[PDB]
Amino acid sequence: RAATAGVRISHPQRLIDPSIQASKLELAEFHARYADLLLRDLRERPVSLVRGPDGIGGELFFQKHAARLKIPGIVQLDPALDPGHPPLLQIRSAEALVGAVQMGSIEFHTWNASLANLERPDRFVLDLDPDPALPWKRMLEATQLSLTLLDELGLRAFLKTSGGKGMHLLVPLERRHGWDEVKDFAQAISQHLARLMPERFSAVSGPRNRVGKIFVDYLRNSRGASTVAAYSVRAREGLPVSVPVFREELDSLQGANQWNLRSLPQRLDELAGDDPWADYAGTRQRISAAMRRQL
Incomplete structure (x- = not known):
């Protein structure tokens, strides 16, 4: 898993984008390779995820909050920041970033404020x-x-x-x-x-x-x-x-x-x-x- 920030990728061959034959593994490797670039934005900001469990031919889940995260390293923020909802999310490492991709994430959008x-x-x-x-x-x-x-x-x-x-x-x-x-x-x-x-x-x-x-x-x-x-x-x-x-x-x-x-x-x-x-x-x-x- 040296090319995926130590994260195990399940169903590595499923296609994120059939038009260019881009697999889930390729997407994960991209996020590992350029994690530092993405972290220039993500490191200190809350992040919303756009997840596509079936690739771009399927539908997308826009997620802001999560009660239980299966992304080793992902940070759950204080519920008081957004009462009545599960914790907001924050990605501060390549492991957390690739873990998000492992869980279906394709897009990462950040807040206009930092921690x-x-x-x-x-x-x-x-x-x-x-x-x-x-x-x-x-x-x-x-x-x-x-x-x-x-x-x-x-x-x-x-x-x-x-x-x-x-x-x-x-x-x-x-x-x-x-x-x-x-x-x-x-x-x-x-x-x-x-x-x-x-x-x-x-x-x-x-x-x-x-x-x-x-x-x-x-x-x-x-x-x-x-x-x-x-x-x-x-x-x-x-x-x-x-x-x-x-x-x-x-x-x-x-x-x-x-x-x-x-x-x-x-x-x-x-x-x-x-x-x-x-x-x-x-x-x-x-x-x-x-x-x-x-x-």
């Missing part, structure tokens, strides 16, 4: 969700326009493909605001973009509210909500990976799912050390009165 203080988010996320019939170039322009606004606000943002159909923007914040304050700020950004360019942006959820447009989704900033971890896999055809990218290579992208679990190695080799999110951990910013004035 240091789960009542003060350390980031907010903006997910640009497009109409399933909108040209990719539209998402490209929408991303640039969103980044320009963030720059004017004086906020450093970190971009990554979603592995699905849109782009994700992570904005770190000092732990000086409550959940509501941060979510409302994110919503204010969405609404601002919607008022400036209503033909491009929407600040209201629901497909019928973004026909031929892009919804600047701020709802993942609700306490308990979560966002796909950078470098993690999506339970979709081709097993796409969510990949951090440089703003300078944004217009060179052709989709939000160009990279997958097998092409990630090529991506890492091409970068050869270059880290799109090199300045993430060192970023120190907070919500200011000036930012609220601009919005």
Whole structure:
């Protein structure tokens, strides 16, 4: 089990994705090999799991809580953090990560807060969700326009493909605001973009509210909500990976799912050390009165 973080994988040959002949064992090995990358996000944050016991051709279980865990190493958080439910979950090691895969996990989504203080988010996320019939170039322009606004606000943002159909923007914040304050700020950004360019942006959820447009989704900033971890896999055809990218290579992208679990190695080799999110951990910013004035 040297390639699976010491974890025994049952039914190693069952297929997670028949389209590319990706087995459960392959998925487990990917998580062992890149555990450190995924842990850059998962290590100190509560995590929600997307489990697919029958692969992507079957259905998916979105799990936040668990009473009994068969994942050696997985941490069960204090029930007081979410009364009336079994413990929340936290993965802090490769063993726990691979163990989750052994138990059917395909996706890992994290909270916008870390164990240091789960009542003060350390980031907010903006997910640009497009109409399933909108040209990719539209998402490209929408991303640039969103980044320009963030720059004017004086906020450093970190971009990554979603592995699905849109782009994700992570904005770190000092732990000086409550959940509501941060979510409302994110919503204010969405609404601002919607008022400036209503033909491009929407600040209201629901497909019928973004026909031929892009919804600047701020709802993942609700306490308990979560966002796909950078470098993690999506339970979709081709097993796409969510990949951090440089703003300078944004217009060179052709989709939000160009990279997958097998092409990630090529991506890492091409970068050869270059880290799109090199300045993430060192970023120190907070919500200011000036930012609220601009919005």
